[PDB]
């Protein structure tokens, strides 16, 4: 049977977790993630996946550092002691 | 499985600590829209694909 039986022989993964996006996309017979070529330096992105370019792009996360630069520019990238 | 990794175990631990209800004192706040926990998960219904 090509169905209800042959869904029974499904117990070994062709995918596991990428260390750069954290989802089950790391093909392991070949070692490349399918949503961001991990060994590759560039993140996988194509301009036909314009939805995918919202689920991963800037603004999605914390923006630990980049959230503060408009605050720092406004003040002129000043430094030193706050004030009296 | 039994002979597992640590990444997996760590994620399972997270999913455990997530598998609790909503604390009732949340519901008494002054502007609250949260009635229950909708990100709830149990091994019968939904498998976490890790």
């Amino acid at each position: 049977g090509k169905g209800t039986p042959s869904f029974g022989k499904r117990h070994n993964k062709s995918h596991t977790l990428c260390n750069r996006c954290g989802r089950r996309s790391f093909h392991v017979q070949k070692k490349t993630c399918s949503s961001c070529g991990y060994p590759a330096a560039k993140t996988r992105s194509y301009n036909w996946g314009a939805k995918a370019k919202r689920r991963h792009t800037t603004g999605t996360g914390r923006m630990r550092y980049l959230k503060h630069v408009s605050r720092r520019f406004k003040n002129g990238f000043q430094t030193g002691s706050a004030s009296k | 499985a039994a002979q597992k990794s640590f990444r997996i175990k760590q994620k399972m631990a997270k999913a455990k600590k997530q598998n609790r209800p909503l604390p009732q004192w949340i519901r008494l706040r002054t502007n609250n829209t949260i009635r229950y926990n909708a990100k709830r998960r149990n091994w019968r219904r939904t498998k976490m694909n890790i």
Partner: protein, 58 residues
């Protein structure tokens, strides 16, 4: 040699036992309402098979 229980932990943080019960009941109810809704709103296009073979020609 024991003092603490979750009940004594939640006594201070607002809800007492009867309010825990009365909260759980409505919490469960609002969890079940949405299930009734999800089943209704899926029931149409759950049985929609992409490649059903229709074992009948003669």
């Amino acid at each position: 040699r024991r003092t603490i229980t979750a009940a004594d932990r939640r006594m201070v943080s607002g809800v007492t036992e009867k309010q825990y019960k009365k909260g759980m009941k409505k919490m469960q109810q609002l969890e079940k309402n949405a299930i009734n809704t999800q089943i209704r709103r899926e029931i149409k296009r759950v049985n929609f098979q992409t490649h059903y073979r229709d074992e009948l020609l003669q």
